[PDB]
From a paper:
In order to reveal the atomic-level details of co-translational folding, we determined the structures of a series of nascent model peptide with increasing amino acid length. For this study, we chose the human Pin1 Trp-Trp domain (WW domain), which consists of 35 residues, as our model peptide. The topology of the WW domain composed of three strands and two beta-hairpins, which form an antiparallel beta-sheet. The structures of the intermediate-length (WW11-MBP, WW17-MBP, WW19-MBP) and full-length (WW35-MBP) WW domains, which are fused with MBP at their C-termini, were determined with X-ray crystallography.
In this study, we prepared WWX, where the X-residue N-terminal WW domain fragments is denoted using the format WWX. WW11, WW17, and WW19 take an alpha-helical conformation. In order to assess the crystal packing effect, three independent structures of WW11 in two crystal forms were compared. Two chains of WW11 in Form I can be superimposed onto each other with an RMSD of 0.22 Å. In addition, the WW11 in Form II can be superimposed onto that in chain A of Form I with an RMSD of 1.65 Å. This indicates that there is little or no packing effect for the structures of the WW domain fragments. The predicted structures of WW11, WW15 and WW35 are nearly identical to the crystal structures. Therefore, the helical conformations in the crystals are not artifacts.
Author numbering: 1 to 380
The structure:
């Protein structure tokens, strides 16, 4: 027998993030190449190489991988996941000086506050819009209710009315919330985790309309991000539902498209969840100063955001100076019109489970594995 030797816990350990460089995680639907260009700028000014990666399921991996040799110095995701990360102590506190704070809309900072700390930098405000083919559909529908009839008409030309991703609850949430579905009730400065609205009559009606759309063969339960994107970008479906990031690929397809208000349901506006794309610094990073310099002086500038935006559009950006130029874009006006009708996502730790529950519920209802009532009861 011997005592455990020095550094044993490091031999049995998961490693350490490398000092002297920057590793960034951002989702694969975002402008990671443009972000790498920013990285390149940072490198030639500082010598510090910036590596940008878009792993799959990064928002799920981060809490297991954060404090390991594979953890990134900087993580990008919509602000909803960050409260969970903060509670898990995964996030370094963010300390921008006053002059820097003033450069971003104050309400974007609020989106990245958890328990009276700033736990990330806000980048851009995101929301879904109805994206339509102006040649197939010069006047897109104002109501969800008229979509089945519109589909039948388009099927006579070997076309369809609507395809969008049915594997992520994010995309059908605007329908679910329209007549009163909600995640967590907000009452007096606080989210009440005991008051969940995925099971009420608004949610049910919304999800039922989706299920009927599928049953009546206006939509297919198996449609995902890729299938719906190809279909719209090839001119096979008249409308899709997506965010600003999706606009680059449509530009390339030379489909003649518009971005407009989502259709109403039961006379009520569709209420898409609003996400603020945010950048957090890893608590286990030994490069926190570099990360701060990168985010504040390279990314969050007119030149930095543009580089990313040109790769894949960001939405309404948190940086005032550059947003004034993006605000003129009709697609951004539409984006903001849809966001305004919806609601910002909660950032509470319970979001992650909420999302998984709602994801499961939609997939099961659409597949017929469960009725709407059974699925949403399970979720609640
Ligand atoms: O579907 C659940 C999912 O919704 C949101 O994810 C969005 C994200 O906000 C967008 O930036 C874009 O990448 O599409 C995603 C949906 O596929 C939540 O932010 C995410 O936490 C949640 O799991």
């Amino acid at each position: 027998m011997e005592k455990l030797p020095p550094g044993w816990e490091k031999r049995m350990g998961s490693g350490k993030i490398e000092e002297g460089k920057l590793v960034i995680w951002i989702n694969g639907d975002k402008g990671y190449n443009g972000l790498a260009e920013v990285g390149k700028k940072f490198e030639k000014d500082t010598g510090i190489k910036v590596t940008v990666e878009h792993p799959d399921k990064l928002e799920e991996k981060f809490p297991q991988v954060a404090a390991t040799g594979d953890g990134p110095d900087i993580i990008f995701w919509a602000h909803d996941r960050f409260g969970g990360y903060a509670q898990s102590g995964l996030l370094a506190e963010i300390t921008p000086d006053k002059a820097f704070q003033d450069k971003l809309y104050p309400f974007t900072w609020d989106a990245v506050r958890y328990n009276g700390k700033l736990i990330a930098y806000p980048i851009a405000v995101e929301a879904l819009s109805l994206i339509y083919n102006k040649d197939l559909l010069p006047n897109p529908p104002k109501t969800w209710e008229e979509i089945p009839a519109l589909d039948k008409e388009l099927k006579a030309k070997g076309k369809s009315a609507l395809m969008f991703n049915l594997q992520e609850p994010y995309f059908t949430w605007p329908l679910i919330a329209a007549d009163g579905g909600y995640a967590f009730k907000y009452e007096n400065g606080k989210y009440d985790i005991k008051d969940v609205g995925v099971d009420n009559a608004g949610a049910k009606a919304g999800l039922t309309f989706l299920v009927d759309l599928i049953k009546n063969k206006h939509m297919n339960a198996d449609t995902d991000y890729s299938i719906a994107e190809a279909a719209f970008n090839k001119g096979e479906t008249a409308m899709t539902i997506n965010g600003p990031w999706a606009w680059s690929n449509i530009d390339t397809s030379k489909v003649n498209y518009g971005v407009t208000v989502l259709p109403t349901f039961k006379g009520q506006p569709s209420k898409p969840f609003v996400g603020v794309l945010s950048a957090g610094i890893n608590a286990a990073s030994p490069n926190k100063e570099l990360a701060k310099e990168f985010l504040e002086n390279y990314l969050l500038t007119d030149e930095g955001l543009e580089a990313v935006n040109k790769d894949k559009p960001l939405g309404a950006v948190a940086l005032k100076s550059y947003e004034e130029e993006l605000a003129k874009d009709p697609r951004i006006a539409a984006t903001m019109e849809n966001a305004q009708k919806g609601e910002i996502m909660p950032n509470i730790p319970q979001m992650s489970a909420f999302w998984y529950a709602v994801r499961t519920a939609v997939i099961n209802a659409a597949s017929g594995r469960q009725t709407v009532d059974e699925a949403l009861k399970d979720a609640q």
